[PDB]
Amino acid sequence: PAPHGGILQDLIARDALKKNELLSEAQSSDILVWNLTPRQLCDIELILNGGFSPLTGFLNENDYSSVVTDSRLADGTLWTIPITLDVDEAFANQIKPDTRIALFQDDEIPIAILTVQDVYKPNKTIEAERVFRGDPEHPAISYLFNVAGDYYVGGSLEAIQLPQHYDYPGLRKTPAQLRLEFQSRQWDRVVAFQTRNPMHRAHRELTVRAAREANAKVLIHPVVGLTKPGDIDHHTRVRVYQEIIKRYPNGIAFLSLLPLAMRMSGDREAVWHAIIRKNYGASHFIVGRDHAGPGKNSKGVDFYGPYDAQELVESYKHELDIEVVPFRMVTYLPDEDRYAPIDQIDTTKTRTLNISGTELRRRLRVGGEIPEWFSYPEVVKILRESNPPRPKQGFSIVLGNSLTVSREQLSIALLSTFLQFGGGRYYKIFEHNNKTELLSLIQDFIGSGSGLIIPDQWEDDKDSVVGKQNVYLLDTSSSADIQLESADEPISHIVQKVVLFLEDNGFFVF
Amino acid sequence: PAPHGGILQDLIARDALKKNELLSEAQSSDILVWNLTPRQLCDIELILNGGFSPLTGFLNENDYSSVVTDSRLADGTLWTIPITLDVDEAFANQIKPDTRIALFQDDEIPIAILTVQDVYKPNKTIEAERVFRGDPEHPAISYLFNVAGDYYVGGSLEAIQLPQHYDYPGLRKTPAQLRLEFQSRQWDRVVAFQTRNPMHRAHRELTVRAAREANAKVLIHPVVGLTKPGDIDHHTRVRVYQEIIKRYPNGIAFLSLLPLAMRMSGDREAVWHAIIRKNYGASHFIVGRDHAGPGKNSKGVDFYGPYDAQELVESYKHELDIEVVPFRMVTYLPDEDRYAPIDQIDTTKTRTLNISGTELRRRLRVGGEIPEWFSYPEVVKILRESNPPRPKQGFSIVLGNSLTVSREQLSIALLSTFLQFGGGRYYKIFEHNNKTELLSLIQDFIGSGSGLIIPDQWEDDKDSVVGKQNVYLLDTSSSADIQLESADEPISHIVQKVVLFLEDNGFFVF
Amino acid sequence: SLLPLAMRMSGDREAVWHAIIRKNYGASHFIVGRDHAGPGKNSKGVDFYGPYDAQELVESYKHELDIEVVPFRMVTYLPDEDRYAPIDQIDTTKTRTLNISGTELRRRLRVGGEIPEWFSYPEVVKILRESNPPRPKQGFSIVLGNSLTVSREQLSIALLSTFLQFGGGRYYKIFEHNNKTELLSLIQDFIGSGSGLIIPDQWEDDKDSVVGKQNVYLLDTSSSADIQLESADEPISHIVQKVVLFLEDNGFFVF
């Protein structure tokens, strides 16, 4: 289908002959420079390659507000997610319209030249409410208030080069490249499958059903740009995708990585995803249950209805110009050993089975055995390997402040005690001295599977520098993960409590 | 048998009622304090519990020189290894005879009070030559010149408490305790087996043959104090011993950990070991091939003859007062599936098999399969788990100084590249900034199995702070582990060389 | 001992007959279980015979059969006790039973399912699977319907080349029958041999009887086509995908 807006805005192609010139300007000592934030690197790449057609830069206030309140660009073009260049007051103050800014990656690789149209201060509360539904726990809202700059810079782009990537060079196909891929294969019907999670059996069946329904080839188009916090890293997922793609009949599916930065904006994002997939050459786009939805908030309430996305996409059906293949909950049928859309069964006459993502991590963290019917063996192997069970996970024991015993001797005791257990885990007494360059290394070790014994707490002003993952506090306080009887409890006693606690949480298995 | 010298010098028992008094003196702000070095903690524990009877302190110059040149204490008592308290000039200068020094552990736990008899400066060259045979690569000689203090402090001890240990509290039996152990069991004949390596099938057979020859019960008495550099840590070995002990018939063997600090002094040490085991209650002591020997030097020549220890022990036979069970090379007999002393076979009429320690590590480092005949499965499992094969080992790539390319970009490229391989390894770009507190952490990560990408070298003055284990240098230099074509070689090229190098060395397996 | 008898599946009458035959052969006792010699149910789901008609009939001729009959009621499996037993001496709900009818049995055999260790011996199932292989090892035919407007020659080649890339030990062949019964009668032979046949044309209705309909699928725009096409001139790659996915859905292909 024709790219959204009618013209694929591949600016790399467009500006080719200005490459050298733009590059010179980008590195001229006079031009103002802004180093792109991670999400911005994702967005900038989708803008320059045509993935965000008709966009050709970051939204000015006129187009931005029109998207917030109208799900459309100022000219009426259907567009639900605002793509803006967020900066800080300090930087915002150095620019005026007509100004040319050089956009860099890692304060080293010049990506593009942005010609300023305007500099405004968005009302983040409206964007949060109208665009992401207002809930403060929503991933896009939390980003908007805690990471995003408070000033947006609307302006047009001139491409120097797409952001740099050293992993999967062959797989990050651009819209132009994907289209050629499909053509060389004479693929004129292609249903695209969005995803940010590893694909299990349900998904494989879902995608094949779609290929059959639409009479089209399958395009696995996963997001490797930025997804929901806590998601499985993309490297692991790519390994999973490349593995599961082999379960499809020969020459029916194609894999391509999408460097998109999701907002987990349920229904709006679904519309957005469809527009993006259309730009990339897809003729069909799948939209299953809770598409692009971030689940429930701490109160247990849904951020979106399980089918809001489908409803929203349905209402823009006649102007999306890409056919949507909707799916209802796809579940497992024990008694028949096969999956099927929930909308064509039940009646109690048939029993179903479903292993939610939650329950999935549990087995992964507890060494549980994931059902042969749920996912392929090769896939679980890859997953377990990236997210090992507790007995192979790292951790830290922080000797609380209330501790009255010798921190030095208690540290040694714990070290010697853990050492006798064996199991391949590496241990270390870790003195941070409140130095962030040491604090920031704590999760690195934990990530490496090592066990750390930290004799002292770090000042509260630095608590943010350390990831709380698998970090336990040994203290007399009520907020201690491992609570002590008294501040001067004898070491052997404290040691037994720490050992049994870790044993109870699966870190040790005898 | 009667402890060496006739009286078990269990000073903990002797000084019991002086415990409180000595403890008060040890913590009095006026007394001079010396914090025991690791090897000293091992020695101090063997002196205070009677393991070094008749010793009751660290050798004065008179007894020390008598041992260096006579293998005897000044009074004629047979004693081959000099046990001295080595300190530095600074400390030596603050003490005179009659002075009382407080000996601490971890500058916190008072171990004993030493009454000074003299302070002398030993001729380390003589001790090295007469006691350890002179070769500069010999472990005891390298320690003597690079770790030991240049001043010795002879003097008598008054025990406050044995050095603190939080691991294996039940297994570190003292001579008095072991003797009681044997008695409660009515064991009047016990053959002790010394060791610093994990026990394999050959050893199990060796020890059983001994039990049968001597008509005595078996005492597995391994060293957990200090052995040969590069040896398997004692925690792993203890796990191995506890595991292999189960392959003995019920109630024939006893396990006890010896906190001895070996000197790897072949024959002399053998004599010493025998004296030590006698003090501990053994009636028999095994002495196999190259007992307490450190193998060969870099030139391939033996530090000791494979049977020097046996010869030396034999010549002191009538005064050791503990029976020695000598063994010749115990090897494997394929054709008969069983081990046997080499002195009672060969003749070519029978083919043998032997997997030297060298070859042993190779399989462990290469994921090789260790023969069912060589060692028990449960044992190899424990070993592999502590010394994982290359595909699970950590490593570091240091971007050499000659590097002309962007260290920042080359770092990211390597990171992104390693990340796509998967396999449970954790990676990190590690910037040390020449800070030893960061440098000293490098081997910790490697030990944790992680892969580090270090963008810059560390000044040569700090090279000692980093263990060279699995640390590779990427440079154009000839001394580079991974040699580059030119300092400005393009990244993708450098990346391929690094990947293929690591792949060739087993770190990556596809 | 093998009995070269030609059954009539005549339930109760046949049971009487069987007993007479076994008596002639030297037996002193003859077993008569549930639905003995019965052909199950008809297309409407109704029984051809009562599950115990045979037993009743045999019982009424008891005094003149001169061979003793050992009657049995439904013998079923007892999970909780791991053992089988006549249904007439249990139930009461106090005990849970289990029964894998013959129907369900073929299903696993055709779907590669795993037959329970309690149901049959391993050595037996092995022999059965080997004689009645699962779909992924079964043969089949795709008949290019008459309504087909595309090049039958090119569509045949496409299907052949497509199936060939899957691998799995199956042998494929474009099979031209030319309405010759000597060729038609060979179709099931190949299917029986596990081979996959691509047949470019239908055979005249007057010969349809010469071919066993087993695993023979019709690719056509008609409603009676096993694999229904959108249009008679649907482009080949499209038709190929439909045929592949259909066969994949019916277990002939597994990836």
Ligand SMILES: Nc1ncnc2c1ncn2[C@@H]1O[C@H](COP(=O)(O)OS(=O)(=O)O)[C@@H](O)[C@H]1O
């Ligand atoms: N059980 C299911 N039934 C129907 N659709 C599903 C099911 N699971 C996942 N999907 C669909 O698969 C696509 C991607 O799934 P996910 O990676 O989990 O999440 S999402 O954030 O990319 O939407 C979405 O269209 C989603 O709705």
Ligand SMILES: Nc1ncnc2c1ncn2[C@@H]1O[C@H](COP(=O)(O)OS(=O)(=O)O)[C@@H](O)[C@H]1O
């Ligand atoms: N193959 C062997 N034949 C005879 N004796 C052996 C053999 N292997 C080991 N031993 C003996 O076992 C004891 C301890 O062995 P090791 O742990 O390797 O080294 S040692 O430094 O403690 O002697 C020593 O008496 C040694 O000589």
Ligand SMILES: Nc1ncnc2c1ncn2[C@@H]1O[C@H](COP(=O)(O)OS(=O)(=O)O)[C@@H](O)[C@H]1O
């Ligand atoms: N579950 C069962 N309980 C009692 N009898 C059975 C059962 N299954 C089979 N039988 C008996 O076994 C004999 C032969 O069984 P089948 O081969 O299945 O069928 S039959 O056509 O020869 O009767 C018959 O007497 C039949 O009634």
Ligand SMILES: [Ca+2]
């Ligand atoms: Ca703000």
Ligand SMILES: [Ca+2]
């Ligand atoms: Ca819900």
Ligand SMILES: [Ca+2]
């Ligand atoms: Ca108290």
Ligand SMILES: [Ca+2]
């Ligand atoms: Ca010196």
Ligand SMILES: [Ca+2]
């Ligand atoms: Ca030799």
Ligand SMILES: [Ca+2]
């Ligand atoms: Ca050059």
Ligand SMILES: [Ca+2]
């Ligand atoms: Ca019935």
Ligand SMILES: [Ca+2]
């Ligand atoms: Ca047509």
Ligand SMILES: [Mg+2]
């Ligand atoms: Mg890129």
Ligand SMILES: [Mg+2]
């Ligand atoms: Mg101790």
Ligand code: NA
């Ligand atoms: Na179009």
Ligand code: NA
């Ligand atoms: Na930089």
Ligand code: NA
């Ligand atoms: Na359609």
